[PDB]
Amino acid sequence: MPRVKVQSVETVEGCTHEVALPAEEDYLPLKPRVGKAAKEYPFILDAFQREAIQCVDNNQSVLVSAHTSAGKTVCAEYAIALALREKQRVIFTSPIKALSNQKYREMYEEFQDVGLMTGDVTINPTASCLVMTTEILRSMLYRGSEVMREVAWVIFDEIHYMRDSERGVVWEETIILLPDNVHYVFLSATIPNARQFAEWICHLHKQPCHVIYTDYRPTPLQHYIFPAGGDGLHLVVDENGDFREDNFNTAMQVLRDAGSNVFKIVKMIMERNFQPVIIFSFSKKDCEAYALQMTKLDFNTDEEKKMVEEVFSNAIDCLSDEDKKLPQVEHVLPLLKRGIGIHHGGLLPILKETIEILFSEGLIKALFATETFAMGINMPARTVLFTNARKFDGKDFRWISSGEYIQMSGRAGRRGMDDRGIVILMVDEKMSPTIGKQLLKGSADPLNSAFHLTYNMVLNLLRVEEINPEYMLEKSFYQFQHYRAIPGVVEKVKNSEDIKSAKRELKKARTVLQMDELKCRKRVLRRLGFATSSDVIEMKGRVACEISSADELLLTEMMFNGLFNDLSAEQATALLSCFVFQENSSEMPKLTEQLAGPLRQMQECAKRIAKVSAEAKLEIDEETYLSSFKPHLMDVVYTWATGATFAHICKMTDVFEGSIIRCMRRLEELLRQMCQAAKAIGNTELENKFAEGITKIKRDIVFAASLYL
Amino acid sequence: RKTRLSKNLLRMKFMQRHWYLDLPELKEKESFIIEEQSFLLCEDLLYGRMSFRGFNPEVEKLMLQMNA
Amino acid sequence: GEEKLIASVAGSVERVNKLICVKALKTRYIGEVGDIVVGRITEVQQKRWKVETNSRLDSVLLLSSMNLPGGELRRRSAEDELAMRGFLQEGDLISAEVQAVFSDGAVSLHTRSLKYGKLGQGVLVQVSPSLVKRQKTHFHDLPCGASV
RNA sequence: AGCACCGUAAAGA
């Protein structure tokens, strides 16, 4: 099992500091700085931040788990400047793209030496500081680019975003790939399993690591409830954390007695002077309809309106004269005039950045935004309101999780301006003290990993000689997290000192999990030509590895069965839209033969893959796998590639626009990848075809600039 | 309250859119003949790129422009 | 030619699902993307090293690629540009793995870890590249008392 | 929470 030694340090109230180090290395604490500071700060740094800096000075990696708005970005700048002082290079991994653009604008303002990498652009890559997403870094770690041998500092933001299922593999794998001679920083939110994370980093790098944790916060919050029609806010918990359910009981009584509302609530808020306000509604139509309802009011002067018109024009002048004449643009601009805004993943990113900036200023007070602001921005406010607790994630129509509740509550509280923040929650259902308590005051949810094996990983790992997947599995978090749950039956056996479990869990204490899936993936890869006996790669593998943006087995089969070799330029774009798009729509479209036929051959290849997967018993289903590929935008993309108008496009489908934009950007990325694949095998007509498709897509707005850039 | 914008916003791009010497021998003197190698000062010349009744009307407006 | 697929080289034909290729019996090493490789240096250009494999061009090891003494990784400067010679002499040997293949055919190679890099004294042989089975773990350490 | 489906009672012409 992983031997590891964890320790605490004697510090003052305000935070807690704890180290994790190899089980056979004694502890000599940090030492003060030597000479000038890398970056002097106007104000005084908390014990939290100064401990982080003292750690970063002595060249030791760190974990920092503290609520947002606690100057958690300071350690990052200190590390960046320290690296640019010693000629080193540094890297800054922000998964989101817009958050990355913001961080780049900031770091460029400050240091003048930075470089951005992202799916859409690339800037000053010869920079001692590289801001970019994480998957880029994954591809680098694979292909050992010219950076890993130069960069000494990594810094992660939103590791808690690793708790997901579809991308929690990236951070883990990236970490496993980094070299022992690296140092880096983790910038998380409140998580109680920090000790396990640190022990993992240590046993994984044989390196010592630090941990900082604190519930500290500069702007304490006050939580209230509103029941339907109660016309009165009832306190539950106070700044001091004193939870008084007396008012909560009264509120529940009002609920029981109850058997154009949020308008009333905002009217209350404004008469109270609680502006500005954030509104978390877990949908899109709700936000838009609330805005329509509340259009009547006005929370701005006329000069502010003129100024918003000025900035709006200076922003949307980068477009054509027609994309301007777009219904969202027009039907929104007055809402912005009036001081209320809306933001959800169904808009044009231009208006999205516009609104984010305006809110940073204050030209809009009430903002209907569902979960975007919750994670990837620093634009706090004075008060926040939860339209409702329920939501949708994955499959379940679950209640709200304390983790997300807190990720949003952290928004309220503007340092300096606001002496405190006002949280409010709307309720329309019986909710006994247990659920309400464990929701409001309950602690965060632990950081569990997903670590689902994937094709791309296996293939890109077959390329290499020094690294194998089994290593990955034995180094992951899903495994290191299965050594504190082991003592259970092991302790039962120690008592027994029944014996079947003894033998088994003794031969399964330091062993591997999730192996069967690995062997089955290998079997598939063999049957389909993506590998061979002796577990070595084959050409199909070196063609698929170039692909990461979609299901690559099926793409390579489509190639090596001769589909794109007979079609036109756009038809290929459409058959790829069949893959990037993953949302459902109301009405499946009607498609012409010339454009549908190919999809039938696609589905036949898919059915073959499904049978070959079922032979190895991957617990997979055929109808789902086959129907996970939505052609609902084939005609959309065809007409777009014919050189048409976005307005002549947003109509054909009862789907929002932002989803189309994501589709098309992923499609262009996939086209670059497929061009490289054809470049690999040896064909040229096909790669020219795909490049021509790309040249057909990018016209006006799907690939516009980021106002933050 | 407030009336004007901010700076961090106002920085973005979509918004912004020896010595001397007196030689009595050669103080107030000037060259009387200068060596040139250009046939333009020498002689007047039209604009190279031209066109006759239709080819590339852009060159026709250039002709109208530079030839006067 | 004239709507007809015509061979170009002497060997056995291989028909993957729909791809028709040929597998000659003697060639010079074409560049793959993860294949390890051993190379004898030929030149030392201001920016990089030029290496000789049994390839149709002059393989390239960029100064950014070569690992540094121990783990002293900060960045590459002119001082490294001048140690570029005193460490990796012209004529020496490197055991690397490919990094990428350019459109002109050349192969840019690097050194992922410390198991790679420069080689000791040992001995060497030059055979044809079509006489080593494509498999894993080219680095063997045999019980006989040596390694290969 | 919502959207859709089915049945049910009632009113007018």
Cβ contact A390 with chain D strand, < 7 A: yes
Residue A428: nearest nucleotide (C-alpha to C1'): D1
Probe site for chain B from A361, A363, A417, A706 (most B CB atoms < 10 A): A361
| Cα separation of the two ends of chain A | 49
* Amino acid at residue number C63: L
Token code pair at residue A29: 């604490």
d(C-alpha C65, C-alpha A148), whole Å: 9
d(C-alpha A92, C-alpha A137), whole Å: 10
Measured in whole angstroms, the distance separating CA A505 from the mean position of its chain's CA atoms is 36
Token code pair at residue A332: 């929104």
Q: Are strands C93-101 and C107-110 parallel, antiparallel or unpaired?
A: antiparallel
| Total number of residues shown for chain B | 68
Token code pair at residue A564: 């794109």
Q: How many CB pairs under 8 A join A and B?
A: 23
Q: Give, as ranges, the nucleotides of chain D with any atom within 7 Å of a protein CB.
A: 1-2
Cβ < 7 Å from strand D, A residues 130-169: none
Three-class secondary structure of residue C98 per DSSP: strand
Q: Do A86 and C16 touch (CB under 8 A)?
A: no
Helix (H) or strand (E) holding A575: helix A569-580
Chain A contact set for C134 (CB, 8 A): 536
Three-class secondary structure of residue A556 per DSSP: helix
- Residue A361 Cα, gap to closest chain B Cα (Å): 7
- Residue C72 Cα, gap to closest chain A Cα (Å): 8
d(C-alpha A253, C-alpha A427), whole Å: 12
Closest to A213 (Cα-Cα) out of A13, A425, A426, A489: A13
Task: Determine the structural domain holding residue B40 and report its residue range.
Answer: 1-68
Find the Å distance, CA of residue A391 to C1' of nucleotide D3.
15
Residue A625 CB partners (closer than 8 Å, separation 6+): A606, A609, A610, A613
d(C-alpha A264, C-alpha A233), whole Å: 12
CA distances from residue A610 to A541, A576, A616, A622, A623 in whole angstroms, order as listed: 19, 19, 10, 6, 9
Q: Are A699 and A643 in contact (CB under 8 A)?
A: yes
d(C-alpha A476, C-alpha B41), whole Å: 80
d(C-alpha A408, C-alpha A279), whole Å: 10
Closest to A151 (Cα-Cα) out of A79, A98, A221, A208: A79
Q: Are A23 and A1 in contact (CB under 8 A)?
A: no
SS (H, E, C) B14-66: HHHCCCCCCCCCCCCCCCCCCCCCCHHHHCCCCCCCCCCCCCCHHHHHHHHHH
d(C-alpha C16, C-alpha A556), whole Å: 12
Q: Is A410 exposed, middle or buried (0-12, 13-18, 19+ CB in 10 A)?
A: buried
d(C-alpha A210, C-alpha A656), whole Å: 45
Cβ contact A429 with chain D strand, < 7 A: yes
Helix (H) or strand (E) holding A550: none
Find the Å distance, CA of residue A156 to C1' of nucleotide D3.
41
Binding residues of A for ATP: 44, 66-73
Find the Å distance, CA of residue A43 to C1' of nucleotide D13.
80
Q: What are phi and psi of A207, to 5 degrees?
A: -115, 145
Number of domains present in the structure of chain B: 1
Chain A contact set for C67 (CB, 8 A): 149
d(C-alpha A89, C-alpha A126), whole Å: 10
Residue C21 CB partners (closer than 8 Å, separation 6+): C13, C14
Three-class secondary structure of residue A502 per DSSP: helix
d(C-alpha A510, C-alpha B3), whole Å: 66
Residue A280 CB partners (closer than 8 Å, separation 6+): A369, A370, A371, A374, A384, A385, A386, A387, A408
Residues facing residue C101 across a β-bridge: C107
Q: Name the DSSP class of C116.
A: S
Q: What are phi and psi of A169, to 5 degrees?
A: -80, -30
Residue A466 CB partners (closer than 8 Å, separation 6+): C112, C113, C115
Contacts 24+ apart (CB under 8 A), A106-111: A107/A77, A107/A80, A107/A131, A109/B8, A109/B11, A110/A77, A111/A80, A111/A81, A111/A84
Q: What are phi and psi of A230, to 5 degrees?
A: -70, -25
Closest to A316 (Cα-Cα) out of A362, A280, A349, A365: A349
How many Cβ atoms from other residues are within 10 Å of residue A204's Cβ?
19
Contacts 24+ apart (CB under 8 A), C48-52: C49/C84, C49/C88, C51/C94, C51/C109
Residues facing residue A129 across a β-bridge: A90
